[PDB]
Amino acid sequence: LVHVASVEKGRSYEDFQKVYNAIALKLREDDEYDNYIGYGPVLVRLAWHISGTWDKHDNTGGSYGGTYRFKKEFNDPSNAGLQNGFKFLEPIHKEFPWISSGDLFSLGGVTAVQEMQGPKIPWRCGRVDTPEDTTPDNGRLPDADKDAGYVRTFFQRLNMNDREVVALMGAHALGKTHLKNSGYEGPGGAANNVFTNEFYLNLLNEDWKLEKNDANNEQWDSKSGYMMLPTDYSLIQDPKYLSIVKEYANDQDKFFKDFSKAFEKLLENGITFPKDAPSPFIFKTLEEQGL
Ligand code: HEM
Numbered sequence: 001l002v003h004v005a006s007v008e009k010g011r012s013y014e015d016f017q018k019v020y021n022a023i024a025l026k027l028r029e030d031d032e033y034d035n036y037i038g039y040g041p042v043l044v045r046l047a048w049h050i051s052g053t054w055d056k057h058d059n060t061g062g063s064y065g066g067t068y069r070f071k072k073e074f075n076d077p078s079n080a081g082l083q084n085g086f087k088f089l090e091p092i093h094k095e096f097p098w099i100s101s102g103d104l105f106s107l108g109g110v111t112a113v114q115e116m117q118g119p120k121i122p123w124r125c126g127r128v129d130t131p132e133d134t135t136p137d138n139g140r141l142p143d144a145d146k147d148a149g150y151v152r153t154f155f156q157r158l159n160m161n162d163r164e165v166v167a168l169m170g171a172h173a174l175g176k177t178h179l180k181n182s183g184y185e186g187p188g189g190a191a192n193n194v195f196t197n198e199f200y201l202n203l204l205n206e207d208w209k210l211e212k213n214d215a216n217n218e219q220w221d222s223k224s225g226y227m228m229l230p231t232d233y234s235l236i237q238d239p240k241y242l243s244i245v246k247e248y249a250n251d252q253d254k255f256f257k258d259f260s261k262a263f264e265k266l267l268e269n270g271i272t273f274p275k276d277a278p279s280p281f282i283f284k285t286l287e288e289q290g291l
Contacts, residue, residue: 001059005126005273008098013281016107016125017236019099020283021291028286030088032086034175037193039088040112041175042124046085047109048171049078050102053136054269056159061140061268065130066101070114072132078141079182102127106267113263114285116174120193122280124273132235144184144229145217148238158269160262166244167258168266171230173199183215186227197256200249202226203236234281 008015014227023043031038043239050068053061067073074083089108093099099107103125110121142154155165177184177194206222213219220228248255264280 003064003271005271005277006128007126007203016281017283020111023108024115024286027115036069040116040193042085043108043112044075044171046079046082050105051266053140054158059270061136063102063267064127064271065134066133070135072135076138079231083177100127100129113195116193116195117289119260122282123258124280146231148234153236154271154283162240163244164262166241167262169258170199170255179215183217184219185213188226188228197248197252200245203245204249
């Protein structure tokens with residue numbers, strides 16, 4: 001399967017910076033969502049789940065085709081709750097009908113991270129919508145109730161190495177789990193709509209307790225009111241993973257630089273970019289724009 005990136009006709013940097021600003025302005029406006037967390041965390045979860053379907057062996061799935069707009073992927077049980085990020089973006093797509101679905105879903109994730117004061121993520125345009133029959137089947141996204149060997153093995157299919165996996169998981173500092181979407185409940189920290197290295201700090205410094213929640217699932221709970229998934233707590237149970245967790249709890253700039261590289265790679269897996277294709281764009285935030 002080859003997927004060649006094709007720039008939307010005649011569009012350049014300035015066009016996509018208008019779509020960025022449109023998403024970013026609505027993230028500021030629709031601030032009441034999910035008890036004032038806002039839409040940022042569900043938008044970086046949407047960009048990870050449309051990319052997380054990729055398989056390195058046959059190049060199926062991935063962010064290229066925008067296939068989450070089809071019923072099969074939209075109704076995957078693993079995507080429960082992401083309908084709220086889709087409905088957030090649907091006004092912006094009506095306003096910029098020329099951008100492809102894969103490009104809009106991945107740029108929403110980029111925009112949310114930068115606007116929540118994360119690191120800059122280089123983004124490349126050129127994803128092309130593909131037919132309903134190209135939609136990957138349900139079951140390619142990871143279970144939460146498993147251990148470190150499961151996480152290591154699952155992520156080799158997206159070929160992410162240990163460092164990449166631990167840097168990517170730092171995004172679970174954002175937002176929260178919702179019992180009616182996943183059978184898990186609670187946030188992982190105090191700052192859950194500001195991008196920081198707090199996931200690593202809480203994992204190493206809180207007193208975690210294995211409890212059962214109302215959906216009868218086990219999760220790690222702390223006195224402070226935070227929670228960690230079984231696969232999150234895995235990172236301090238494995239010796240290779242644990243020493244990268246310590247590196248990111250002790251250096252927020254290294255965490256930001258490694259997250260940026262692994263999130264761009266996540267979003268770009270499966271896509272062939274021609275050498276006459278433009279460079280990755282670095283978008284300015286509303287703040288750097290005075291907007
Ligand atoms: C083995 C890996 C992973 C598993 C099993 C997993 C699982 C989950 C689960 C069960 C939730 C709760 C969903 C809900 O109830 O609403 C969640 C939320 C979230 N996840 Fe993951 N995840 C994984 C990796 C990642 C990665 C790699 C990213 C991003 C780069 C990510 C970003 C998020 C975000 C931002 C939320 C919060 C969503 C919200 O607030 O609504 N996840 N994750």
